[PDB]
Amino acid sequence: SVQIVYK
Amino acid sequence: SVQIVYK
Amino acid sequence: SVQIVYK
Amino acid sequence: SVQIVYK
Amino acid sequence: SVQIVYK
Amino acid sequence: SVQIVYK
Amino acid sequence: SVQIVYK
Amino acid sequence: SVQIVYK
Amino acid sequence: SVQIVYK
Amino acid sequence: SVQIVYK
Amino acid sequence: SVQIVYK
Amino acid sequence: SVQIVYK
Amino acid sequence: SVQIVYK
Amino acid sequence: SVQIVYK
Amino acid sequence: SVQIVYK
Amino acid sequence: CDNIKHVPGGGSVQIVYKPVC
Amino acid sequence: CDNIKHVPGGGSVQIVYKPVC
Amino acid sequence: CDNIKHVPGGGSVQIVYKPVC
Amino acid sequence: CDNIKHVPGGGSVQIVYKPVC
Amino acid sequence: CDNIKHVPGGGSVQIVYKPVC
Amino acid sequence: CDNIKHVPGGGSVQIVYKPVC
Amino acid sequence: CDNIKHVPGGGSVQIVYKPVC
Amino acid sequence: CDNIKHVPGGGSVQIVYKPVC
Amino acid sequence: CDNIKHVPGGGSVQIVYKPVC
Amino acid sequence: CDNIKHVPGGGSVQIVYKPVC
Amino acid sequence: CDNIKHVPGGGSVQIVYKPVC
Amino acid sequence: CDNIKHVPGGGSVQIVYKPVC
Amino acid sequence: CDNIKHVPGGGSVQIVYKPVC
Amino acid sequence: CDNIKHVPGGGSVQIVYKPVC
Amino acid sequence: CDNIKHVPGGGSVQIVYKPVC
Ligand SMILES: *Cc1cccc(C*)c1
Ligand SMILES: *Cc1cccc(C*)c1
Ligand SMILES: *Cc1cccc(C*)c1
Ligand SMILES: *Cc1cccc(C*)c1
Numbered sequence: 001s002v003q004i005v006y007k
Numbered sequence: 008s009v010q011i012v013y014k
Numbered sequence: 015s016v017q018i019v020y021k
Numbered sequence: 022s023v024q025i026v027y028k
Numbered sequence: 029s030v031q032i033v034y035k
Numbered sequence: 036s037v038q039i040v041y042k
Numbered sequence: 043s044v045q046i047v048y049k
Numbered sequence: 050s051v052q053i054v055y056k
Numbered sequence: 057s058v059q060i061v062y063k
Numbered sequence: 064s065v066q067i068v069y070k
Numbered sequence: 071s072v073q074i075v076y077k
Numbered sequence: 078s079v080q081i082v083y084k
Numbered sequence: 085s086v087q088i089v090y091k
Numbered sequence: 092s093v094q095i096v097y098k
Numbered sequence: 099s100v101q102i103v104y105k
Numbered sequence: 106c107d108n109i110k111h112v113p114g115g116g117s118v119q120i121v122y123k124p125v126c
Numbered sequence: 127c128d129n130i131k132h133v134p135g136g137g138s139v140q141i142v143y144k145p146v147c
Numbered sequence: 148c149d150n151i152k153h154v155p156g157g158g159s160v161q162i163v164y165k166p167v168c
Numbered sequence: 169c170d171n172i173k174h175v176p177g178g179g180s181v182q183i184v185y186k187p188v189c
Numbered sequence: 190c191d192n193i194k195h196v197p198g199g200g201s202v203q204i205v206y207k208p209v210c
Numbered sequence: 211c212d213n214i215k216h217v218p219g220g221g222s223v224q225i226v227y228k229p230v231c
Numbered sequence: 232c233d234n235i236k237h238v239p240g241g242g243s244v245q246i247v248y249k250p251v252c
Numbered sequence: 253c254d255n256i257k258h259v260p261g262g263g264s265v266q267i268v269y270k271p272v273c
Numbered sequence: 274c275d276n277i278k279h280v281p282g283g284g285s286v287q288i289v290y291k292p293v294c
Numbered sequence: 295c296d297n298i299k300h301v302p303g304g305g306s307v308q309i310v311y312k313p314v315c
Numbered sequence: 316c317d318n319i320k321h322v323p324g325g326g327s328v329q330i331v332y333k334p335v336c
Numbered sequence: 337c338d339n340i341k342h343v344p345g346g347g348s349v350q351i352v353y354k355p356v357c
Numbered sequence: 358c359d360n361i362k363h364v365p366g367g368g369s370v371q372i373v374y375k376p377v378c
Numbered sequence: 379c380d381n382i383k384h385v386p387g388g389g390s391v392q393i394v395y396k397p398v399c
Numbered sequence: 400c401d402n403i404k405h406v407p408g409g410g411s412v413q414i415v416y417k418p419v420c
C-alpha cells in the first residue's frame with residue numbers, strides 16, 4: 001500500500 | 008490500496 | 015481501493 | 022472502489 | 029463502486 | 036468453441 | 043475450447 | 050483448452 | 057490445458 | 064498443464 | 071497511428 | 078506507431 | 085514503434 | 092523499437 | 099531496440 | 106457486471122466464454 | 127466485476143474462459 | 148474484480164482460464 | 169483483485185490458469 | 190492482489206498456474 | 211481513444227472506472 | 232490511447248481505475 | 253499508450269490503478 | 274508505453290500502482 | 295517502456311509500485 | 316478469434332493495432 | 337486466439353501491435 | 358493463444374509488439 | 379501460449395518484443 | 400509457454416526480447 005502525505 | 012492525502 | 019482526500 | 026473526498 | 033463526495 | 040454434453 | 047462432460 | 054469431466 | 061477429473 | 068484428479 | 075505507404 | 082514501408 | 089522497411 | 096530491414 | 103538486417 | 110447475486114442450484118452449469126466486461 | 131455475491135450450490139460447475147475484465 | 152464475496156458450496160468447481168483482469 | 173473474501177466450502181476446487189491481474 | 194481474505198474450508202484445493210500479478 | 215486534447219480546468223475531477231479501450 | 236495531449240490544470244484530479252487498454 | 257504528451261499542471265494528481273496496457 | 278514525453282509540473286504527484294505493461 | 299523522455303519538474307513525486315513491464 | 320484459417324497471399328499486409336480480444 | 341491455422345504466403349508481413357488477448 | 362498451427366511461408370515476417378496474452 | 383506448433387519456413391523472421399504471457 | 404513444438408526451418412530467425420512469461 002502506497003501511503004504518501006504531501007505537506 | 009493507494010492512500011494519498013494532499014495537504 | 016484508491017482513497018484520496020484532497021485538502 | 023474509488024473513494025475520493027474533495028475538500 | 030465509485031463513491032465521490034464533492035465538498 | 037464450447038462443446039458441452041449433458042449426460 | 044471448453045470441453046466439459048457432465049456424468 | 051479446459052477439459053473437465055464431472056463423474 | 058487444465059484437465060480435471062472429479063471422482 | 065494442470066492435471067488434478069479428485070478422488 | 072498506423073502509417074503504411076504501399077510502394 | 079507502426080510505420081511500415083513496402084518497397 | 086515498429087519501423088519495418090520491406091525491400 | 093523494432094527496426095528490421097529486409098534486404 | 100531489436101535491429102535486424104536480413105541480407 | 107455489478108451487484109450480481111449468483112446463487113447456482115443443484116447441478117447447474119454456467120459457461121462464460123471470452124467475455125470483455 | 128464488482129459486488130458479486132457468488133454462492134455456488136451443490137455440484138455446480140462454473141467455467142470462465144479467457145475473460146478480459 | 149472488486150468486493151467479491153465468493154462462497155463456494157459443496158462440490159463446486161470454478162475454473163478461470165487465462166484472465167486478464 | 170481487491171477485497172476478495174474467498175471462503176471455500178467443503179470439497180471445492182478452484183483453478184486459476186495463467187492469470188495476468 | 191490486495192486485501193484478500195482467503196479462508197479455505199475443509200478439503201479445498203486452489204491452484205494458481207503461472208500468474209503474472 | 212485517439213487525438214484527445216484533454217485540458218482540465220480548475221477543480222475538475224474525472225474518473226474512468228474499469229475501461230476496456 | 233494514442234496521441235493524447237493531457238494538460239491538467241490547477242487542482243485537477245484524474246483517476247483511472249483498472250484499465251485494460 | 254503511444255505518443256502521450258503528458259504535461260501536468262500545478263497541483264495535479266493522477267492515479268492509474270492496476271492497468272494492463 | 275512508447276514515446277511518452279512526461280513533463281511533470283510544479284507539485285505534481287503521479288502514482289502507478291501494479292501496472293503490467 | 296520504450297523511448298520515454300521523463301523530465302520531472304520542481305517538486306514532482308512519481309511512484310511506480312510493483313510493475314511487471 | 317476462434318477457428319481462423321488465415322492464408323495470406325502474395326504481397327499481403329495485415330496490421331492489427333491494439334486489439335483486446 | 338484459439339485454433340488458428342496461420343499459414344503465411346510468399347512475402348507476407350503481419351504486425352500485431354500491443355494486443356491484450 | 359492455444360492450439361496455434363503457425364506455419365510461416367517463404368519470406369514471411371511476423372512482428373508481435375508488447376502482447377499481454 | 380499453449381500447444382503451439384511453430385514450424386518456421388525458409389527465410390522466416392519472427393520477433394516478439396516485450397511479451398508478458 | 401507450455402507444450403511448444405518449435406521446429407525452425409531453414410534460415411529462420413526468431414528473437415524474443417525481454418519476455419516475462
Ligand atoms: C457478470 C459477469 C459474469 C461472468 C463474467 C463476466 C465478465 C461478467
Ligand atoms: C465477475 C467475474 C467473474 C469471473 C472472472 C472475471 C474476470 C470476472
Ligand atoms: C473476479 C476474478 C476472479 C478470478 C480471476 C480474476 C482475474 C478475477
Ligand atoms: C482475484 C484473483 C484470484 C486469483 C488469481 C488472481 C491473479 C486474481
Ligand SMILES: *Cc1cccc(C*)c1
Pocket residue numbers: 169189190191193205208209210
Ligand atoms: C491474488 C493472487 C492469488 C494468487 C497468486 C497471485 C499472483 C495473486
Ligand SMILES: *Cc1cccc(C*)c1
Pocket residue numbers: 211212214226229230231232247250252
Ligand atoms: C479516451 C480514454 C480516456 C481514459 C481511459 C481510456 C481507456 C480512454
Ligand SMILES: *Cc1cccc(C*)c1
Pocket residue numbers: 211232233235247250251252253268271273
Ligand atoms: C488513454 C489512457 C489513459 C490512462 C490509462 C490508459 C490505459 C489509457
Ligand SMILES: *Cc1cccc(C*)c1
Pocket residue numbers: 232252253254256268271272273274289292294
Ligand atoms: C497511457 C498510460 C498511462 C499510465 C499507465 C499505462 C499503463 C498507460
Ligand SMILES: *Cc1cccc(C*)c1
Pocket residue numbers: 253274275277289292293294295310313315
Ligand atoms: C506508460 C507507463 C507509465 C508508468 C508505468 C508503466 C508500466 C507504463
Ligand SMILES: *Cc1cccc(C*)c1
Pocket residue numbers: 274294295296298310313314315
Ligand atoms: C515506463 C516504466 C516506468 C517505470 C517502471 C517501469 C517498469 C516502466
Ligand SMILES: *Cc1cccc(C*)c1
Pocket residue numbers: 316317319331334335336337352355357
Ligand atoms: C482474430 C484475431 C486476429 C488478430 C489479433 C487478434 C487479437 C484476434
Ligand SMILES: *Cc1cccc(C*)c1
Pocket residue numbers: 316337338340352355356357358373376378
Ligand atoms: C490470435 C492472435 C494473434 C497474435 C497475437 C495475439 C495476442 C493473438
Ligand SMILES: *Cc1cccc(C*)c1
Pocket residue numbers: 337358359361373376377378379394397399
Ligand atoms: C498467439 C500469440 C502469438 C504471439 C504472442 C502471443 C503472446 C500470443
Ligand SMILES: *Cc1cccc(C*)c1
Pocket residue numbers: 358379380382394397398399400415418420
Ligand atoms: C506464444 C508465445 C510466443 C512467444 C512469446 C510468448 C511469451 C508467447
Ligand SMILES: *Cc1cccc(C*)c1
Pocket residue numbers: 379400401403415418419420
Ligand atoms: C513460449 C516462449 C518462448 C520464448 C520465451 C518465452 C519466455 C516463452
